[PDB]
C-alpha cells in the first residue's frame, strides 16, 4: 500500500553491513530528500538519517544513507544487539502534497 517500496523483512548478524532500499517516484524521491526512521519494537519511532547527509542528535556515525534517482539505500556498518528495529522512508510529495511513507523493513539480529 505504501508508495515507497521497502522490503518487508531483513536479517543480519552482528558486525556486518546490510543495505535496505526504498524506491518511490521522481516527484518525491527524485525531487526531494528521503528521511530514514528507526523504531524499536514496543517503543516510539526515532530519526536515524535525515537530509541523507547528517544525523539529528549525534546518532552513531556508523549509520549511513544514500540517494540516487528514485531510489534510496540505508547502509549500517556495525550491527549490534538492539539494532532490531523497523526502518521507514519518508518524503514530501507534490502530487499528493503530503509526506509519503514506506512500508517499513525489520532489521533483526541473528544468533
Amino acid at each position: 500500500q505504501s508508495v515507497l517500496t521497502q522490503p518487508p523483512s531483513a536479517s543480519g548478524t552482528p558486525g556486518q553491513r546490510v543495505t535496505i532500499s526504498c524506491s518511490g517516484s521522481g516527484s518525491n524521491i527524485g525531487s526531494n530528500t528521503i528521511n530514514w526512521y528507526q523504531q524499536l519494537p514496543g517503543t516510539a519511532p526515532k530519526v536515524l538519517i535525515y537530509r541523507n547527509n547528517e544525523r539529528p542528535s549525534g546518532v552513531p556515525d556508523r549509520f549511513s544513507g544514500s540517494k540516487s534517482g528514485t531510489s534510496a539505500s540505508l547502509t549500517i556498518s556495525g550491527l549490534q544487539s538492539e539494532d532490531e528495529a523497523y526502518y521507514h522512508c519518508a518524503a514530501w510529495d507534490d502530487s499528493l502534497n503530503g509526506p509519503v511513507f514506506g512500508g517499513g523493513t525489520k532489521l533483526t539480529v541473528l544468533g
Binding site: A44, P45, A90, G98
Partner: protein, 118 residues
C-alpha cells in the same frame, strides 16, 4: 520535548474516536503535532498537519474528511476525532513535533502512541 498521548482505546466500528496528545515544557503556539497513523509491525502513514494559530490544517490526500483537528493553546493540547470507523483502523496514533523552523513541518519526535482497536 516530551509528548503524552492517551491510552489504549477500543471502539465499535462506525463510531467516533477522541484522542489527544499534550505539550509539556515547550511553546505550544510555536510547536505543532502532525498526527501519523501507525499499524503494528507495518509502515507509517501520515494523517494530518495543523497549526495552533488560526486553526488551519491539512488532512490526508486519500480522505477529504474522516478526521477532524482541534487545538487548545490554553491547555496546550491537540485533539483528533475519527468518524466512519472501519476494521482497517486498528492501528496507533503517534502525533509528531515538527523538527525546527518555528515547528510547523517535518518530523522530529513522537508521543508514546495511542493504540486503537476497531
Amino acid at each position: 520535548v516530551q509528548l503524552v498521548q492517551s491510552g489504549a482505546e477500543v471502539k465499535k466500528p462506525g463510531s467516533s474516536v477522541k484522542v489527544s496528545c499534550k505539550a509539556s515544557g515547550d511553546t505550544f503556539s510555536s510547536y505543532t503535532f502532525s498526527w501519523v497513523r501507525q499499524a503494528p509491525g507495518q509502515g507509517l502513514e501520515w494523517m494530518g498537519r495543523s497549526i495552533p494559530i488560526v486553526g488551519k490544517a491539512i488532512y490526508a490526500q486519500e480522505f477529504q474528511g474522516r478526521v477532524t483537528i482541534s487545538a487548545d493553546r490554553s491547555t496546550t493540547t491537540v485533539y483528533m476525532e475519527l468518524s466512519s470507523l472501519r476494521s482497517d483502523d486498528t492501528a496507533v496514533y503517534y502525533c509528531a513535533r515538527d523538527q525546527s523552523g518555528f515547528d510547523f513541518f517535518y518530523y522530529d519526535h513522537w508521543g508514546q502512541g495511542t493504540l486503537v482497536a476497531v
